[PDB]
Design a protein around this ligand. Structure first.
Ligand SMILES: [Mg+2]
Ligand SMILES: [Zn+2]
Lengths: 52, 234, 55, 45, 111, 162, 392
RNA sequence: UAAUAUUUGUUUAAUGAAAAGUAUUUUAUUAUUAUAUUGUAUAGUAUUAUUAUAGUGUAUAGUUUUUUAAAAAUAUAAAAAAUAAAGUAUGAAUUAAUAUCAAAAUUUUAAUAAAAAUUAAAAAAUU
RNA sequence: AUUUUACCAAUUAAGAAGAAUAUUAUAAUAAUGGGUGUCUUAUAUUUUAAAUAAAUAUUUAAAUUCCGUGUAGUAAAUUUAUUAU
């Protein structure tokens, strides 16, 4: 697809392949799983800060 | 002066201090006395003889058994000077400059960088250029003007960078013997240019099918327009 | 061996005539007048010229 | 212990093959030589 | 670090494409900012030391080295991963040094 | 007895070249960009590597028939187990393939074809162009007549190399 | 136990109960992995141990990704190929410009001067040659650029070819176009055969005869004039005589003869053809036919200074099984230095050629001598092949 | 150590083979008389090891990979005989503080003393 | 001439996506035994028991086979507490 896009010049939006970032490990996790709600986390990121 | 930087080379190689290496100075090869360990006394002529002449031959040196380059030929040196011109100044750029200052700032610096470098390596090659005008050839006498033109440098006959001397006070300047550095460049380039004009007319007097007809039309045409750009006639 | 030999002991073997005769020796040859190959005198080729008259 | 490796490492050029090639061998050779000549110079020559 | 120059190291390695975006360009700290100048090489000219543009200087050096190696009347062949030993091959080489191509090929053919 | 061979002392002692600390070659910022082989005096016209595929038959024409090499079509260990690559080709994979990482796509993606755009850093700096095509998953942009290089289209039955 | 490292590459003795390792047949070493494991890499698909995961990505990008080009693109690419007329013009121009600036060789005294290499000249000429369709000697080119006379001819013939290709059309392209969908040799083509003969003439002075003979083939390819054909065939006769191509000389020797009616009276060509035909006959040891041919030459051409020379030389010189055995000239000695059978290699006992594959001399499909595999073949359970009692 | 040892593929009665727990059969394959389902070829001892273990069942498929141009001594057999050593190719292992080496004799020194001192007279290579 | 004696020498800057969701400690909010190429069935899928423990404690005195053993609520649910892509 790299070669073909380099030739034809078409724009490509979505990746031509699916990437499973867990390397097949997400199937090990039960289907109903969701992360818990964490309160009062440590971090500076939720303060949106542009200049520091 | 043997191993590191020759007569007509373009390197600046500092023989006494090793600035290109990847490792501390472990074993000093030329050594005379065992007192060279803690106080080598390099910098004395008689010990740097022994050190520098024990260095392995470089790509610059071309040691004895190996066949060396024909450098002092004018016919090598002129296209050498010419390949410096296409370095700083690109073809496109050249065209835009040929037309006629509106130029990208970034771009401008390349022109003055061309001028700078060309000045330098003219300084390097002229001790080999002054050797060779004698057997130099009709094309590459003309190349001297072509290459200066392409690098956008006007040659001093009395834009131009070749006229002024680099500033520094004569007490502070480096006068050390054995390093070939000509202190008057604009005075010895000028009388190089005059010489190489005078030799050209010799060979055009010497040179007097359709091949010779067209050739003798064309190069005679190239003389007045190339020498004319540097302000020289005939 | 009871000890490591230095470059000199390694270099001692090349002074010998056995070494020189075995390894660094040039062969004498001429051109086979029938085959034009380089040839040592006394060794021939399988070719019907070179069997009867063996040049 | 100070054996003066880092000064004598610069001398090796005056030693023949096995000593000038490999470091420790050469350093032993130079340590021996210089101690010997020192001793000799002070008491005999 | 209160000012991180890009060619320097912090929790990092020498990743050279990341460290220096442009090899020709040179990065330094000026007036508490990252300020980026053109790299120069110091070269002796008239006995003073003059600054020349580094990039074209270097590429010119390698240019002339390649061309002085090239326009020479020789041919240098390098053969790699030869399937012999070092000692044996050195032995078999030392016969052939300083010979005509004719005698070289003949002595190679006859052993 | 007519040739002259004195044993070279390098085969007796071959210490490895000193390895770099943090890959930092201490003098990069000092010395030129000249290839060290060139300044050393090393040059070659052809480099013929016998580990290449094409050269393979003369690699087998120079060896002796007496030396056997076993396991030509089979292998002592079963090759159908998944076992990982050696590490530096894993590094090649990673450096070549960065866009396989999670969230490599840039958040609320702005660049769409047709926009007029300056090149801020690197080569072609200060050049305005129009976005021709967008390769989104790589975070890459094709800009009109900027970064134009050659593409080699190989020979085949009917065509030459273009 | 353990007089060496704990690595599975390390030098000295190990023991199994202390330093257990599994059986690695050929384990690629610490540095470069060598030609042996690579032999295995290119034949059976991986390294012989089966622990090294075959990773070929770096050549997939080299061969298969590069040739990918889709149909929609490659259906349009040949509509964009360069104009060959223009390419011939440009090639001729810059080749000539590059040849004109070649420095005149300085003549030293007491020692021969090394000619300046033609490095910059290979680049224009390699474009020019296959824009034209004829391969040209580098050696012959340099030798032509040595002699001032040859350089003169080469230069002005290049100039004429240039001018004729700019003002006129390209005649071989004309007669290539009119062929698939007859006339005397055109101006440009005359220029071309002239410069190719010049460069072959230079190719001979340096003593590359095979190449000089190979250059002139295309030279006759471009000549439709019977005068040109006669001269060129003659020239190839001589250039294949020096190459010891005797069937080639005794082929091309007689066409140059066959053209004698329709070639002008002002030609030396046909006589040269006689000389070559005769000389080739002479070199193969048939002297009678040689003298017969020179007799014919002096019959038809009366006195001829080359046929004088060859009649009296033959005269001075004056079994079928032993003919053309002798090695009479040095170029086949040169060709015998290469391509010969030496002790231990390139003989019939090392590797034998079969259908473009290498074999050991044990399986030699043209030979059943002792040690050969085909002696062990048996009778294959059908009929008894030979009356041999014990073996086979 | 190591221009070393080893290897070295010019003629087969290993007939057979379930107990091997590894080896991309691309469709290995019935024509059945039988029904569904399932499954057929080379890795025991770290090896393509000295060479397997055991149960079938049978006797004319020769059922088809072992280098080499002298002699000592070692190994068999009858100091004779058979075998093996300059060889092209592959290429390990024990050992290694050493200076280009350390040869001969005499005494001494805290126990051989290649430690001293003195006289002396050890060339190189190969076996 | 057929032939330029025998012997005697080093120590290398490094050509390059062939070193990063990298190693180690650090997060006092989750936590029935993680298993993807998985997928009827559970007669055959049971781990419980008052103790020193996946729960780990702010002094030098006294006294005890005289000679190796020793500090008690700090606040009563109070903020030393087994955290984590
Ligand atoms: Mg690296
Ligand atoms: Zn022959």
């Amino acid at each position: 697809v790299d070669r073909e896009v380099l030739l034809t010049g078409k724009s490509v939006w979505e990746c031509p392949i699916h990437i499973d970032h867990t390397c097949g490990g997400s199937k090990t996790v039960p289907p109903h799983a969701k992360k818990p709600v964490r309160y009062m986390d440590a971090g500076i990121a939720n303060v949106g800060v542009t200049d520091i | 002066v043997y191993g590191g930087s020759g007569r007509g080379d373009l390197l600046y190689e500092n023989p006494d201090a090793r600035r290109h290496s990847g490792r501390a100075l472990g074993v000093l090869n030329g050594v005379r006395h065992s007192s060279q360990a803690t106080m080598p006394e390099s910098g004395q002529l008689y010990y740097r003889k022994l050190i520098l002449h024990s260095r392995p031959p470089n790509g610059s040196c071309a040691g004895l058994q190996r066949h060396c380059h024909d450098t002092c030929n004018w016919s090598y040196l002129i296209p050498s000077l010419h390949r410096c011109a296409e370095s700083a100044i690109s073809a496109k750029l050249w065209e835009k400059m040929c037309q006629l200052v509106n130029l990208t700032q970034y771009e401008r610096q390349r022109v003055r960088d061309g001028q700078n470098l060309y000045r330098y390596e003219v300084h390097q090659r002229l001790p080999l250029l002054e050797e060779s005008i004698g057997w130099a050839q009709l094309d590459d006498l003309l190349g001297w003007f072509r290459s200066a033109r392409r690098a956008w440098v006007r040659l001093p006959t009395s834009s131009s960078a070749m006229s002024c001397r680099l500033e520094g006070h004569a007490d502070s300047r480096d006068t050390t013997p054995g390093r070939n550095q000509v202190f008057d460049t604009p005075e010895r380039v000028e009388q190089l240019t005059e010489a190489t004009v005078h030799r050209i007319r010799e060979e055009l007097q010497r040179l007097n099918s359709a091949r010779r007809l067209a050739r003798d039309e064309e190069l005679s045409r190239c003389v007045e327009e190339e020498l004319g750009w540097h302000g020289v006639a005939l | 061996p009871k000890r490591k030999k230095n470059p000199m002991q390694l270099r001692r073997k090349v002074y010998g005539l056995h070494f020189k005769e075995k390894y660094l020796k040039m062969e004498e040859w001429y051109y086979c007048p029938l085959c034009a190959e380089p040839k040592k005198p006394g060794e021939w080729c399988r070719r019907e010229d070179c069997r009867q008259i063996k040049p | 212990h100070y054996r003066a490796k880092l000064e004598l490492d610069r001398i090796r050029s005056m030693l023949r093959g096995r000593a000038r090639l490999e470091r420790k061998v050469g350093l032993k050779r130079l340590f021996f030589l210089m101690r010997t000549q020192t001793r000799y110079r002070v008491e005999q020559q | 670090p209160r000012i991180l120059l890009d060619r320097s190291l912090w929790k990092s390695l020498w990743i050279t494409k990341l460290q220096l975006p442009d090899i020709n360009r040179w990065e330094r700290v000026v007036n508490s900012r990252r300020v980026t100048e053109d790299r120069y090489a110091f070269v002796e000219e008239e006995g003073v030391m003059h600054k020349v543009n580094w990039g074209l200087y270097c590429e010119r050096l390698e240019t002339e080295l390649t061309v002085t190696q090239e326009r020479l009347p020789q041919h240098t062949l390098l053969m790699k991963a030869v399937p012999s030993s070092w000692k044996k091959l050195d032995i078999d080489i030392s016969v052939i040094r300083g010979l005509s191509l004719r005698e070289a090929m003949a002595q190679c053919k006859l052993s | 007895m007519y040739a002259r061979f004195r044993t070279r002392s390098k085969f007796y002692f071959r210490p490895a070249r000193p390895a770099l600390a943090y890959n930092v070659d201490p003098n990069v910022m000092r010395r030129p960009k000249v290839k060290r082989g060139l300044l050393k005096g090393t040059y070659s016209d052809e480099t013929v590597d016998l580990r290449d595929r094409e050269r393979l038959e003369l690699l087998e024409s120079m060896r002796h028939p007496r030396e056997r090499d076993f396991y030509q079509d089979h292998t002592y260990h079963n090759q159908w187990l998944r076992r990982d690559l050696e590490k530096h080709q894993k590094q090649q994979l990673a450096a070549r393939y960065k866009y396989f990482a999670p969230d490599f796509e840039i958040s609320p993606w702005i660049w769409y074809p047709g926009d007029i755009v300056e090149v801020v850093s690197g080569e072609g700096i200060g050049q305005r162009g129009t976005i021709i095509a967008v390769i989104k998953y790589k975070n890459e942009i094709v800009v009109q007549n900027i970064n134009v290089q050659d593409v080699v289209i190989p020979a085949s039955e009917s065509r030459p190399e273009q | 136990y353990q007089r060496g490292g704990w690595s599975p590459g390390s030098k000295h003795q190990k023991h199994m109960t202390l330093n257990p390792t599994l059986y690695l047949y050929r384990f690629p070493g610490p540095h470069g992995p060598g030609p042996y494991t690579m032999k295995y890499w290119w034949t059976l698909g991986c390294f012989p141990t089966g622990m090294e995961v075959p990773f070929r990505l770096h050549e997939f990008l080299s061969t298969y990704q590069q040739e990918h080009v889709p149909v929609e693109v490659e259906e349009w690419l040949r509509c964009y190929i360069k104009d060959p007329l223009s390419e011939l013009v440009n090639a001729s121009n810059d080749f000539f410009k590059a040849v004109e600036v070649y420095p005149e060789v300085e003549s030293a005294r007491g020692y021969k001067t090394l000619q300046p290499s033609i490095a910059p000249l290979l680049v224009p000429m390699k474009k020019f040659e296959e824009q034209l369709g004829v391969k040209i000697s580098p050696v012959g080119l340099r030798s032509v650029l040595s002699n001032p006379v040859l350089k003169d001819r080469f230069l002005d013939d290049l100039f004429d070819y240039k001018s004729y290709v700019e003002k006129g059309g390209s005649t071989p392209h004309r007669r290539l176009a009119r062929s698939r969908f007859a006339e005397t040799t055109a101006d440009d083509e005359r220029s071309l055969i002239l410069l190719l003969t010049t460069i072959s003439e230079g190719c001979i002075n340096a003593g590359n005869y095979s190449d000089a003979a190979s250059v002139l083939a295309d030279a006759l390819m471009f000549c439709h004039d019977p005068d040109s054909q006669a001269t060129t065939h003659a020239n190839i006769s001589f250039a294949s005589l020096l190459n010891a191509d005797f069937k080639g000389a005794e082929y091309n020797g007689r066409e140059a003869a066959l053209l004698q009616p329709q070639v002008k009276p002002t030609s030396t060509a046909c006589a040269r053809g006689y000389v070559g035909w005769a000389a080739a006959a002479a070199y193969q040891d048939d002297f009678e036919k040689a003298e017969a041919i020179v007799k014919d030459g002096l019959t038809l051409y009366v006195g001829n200074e080359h046929l004088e020379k060859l009649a009296n030389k033959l005269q001075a010189l004056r079994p079928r099984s032993l003919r053309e055995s002798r090695s009479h000239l040095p170029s086949q000695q040169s060709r015998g230095l290469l391509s010969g059978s030496g002790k231990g290699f390139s003989n019939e006992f090392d590797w034998v050629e079969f259908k473009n594959k290498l074999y050991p001399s044990k399986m030699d499909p043209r030979n059943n001598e002792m040690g050969s595999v085909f002696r062990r073949v048996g009778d294959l359970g059908s009929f008894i092949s030979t009356s041999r009692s014990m073996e086979r």
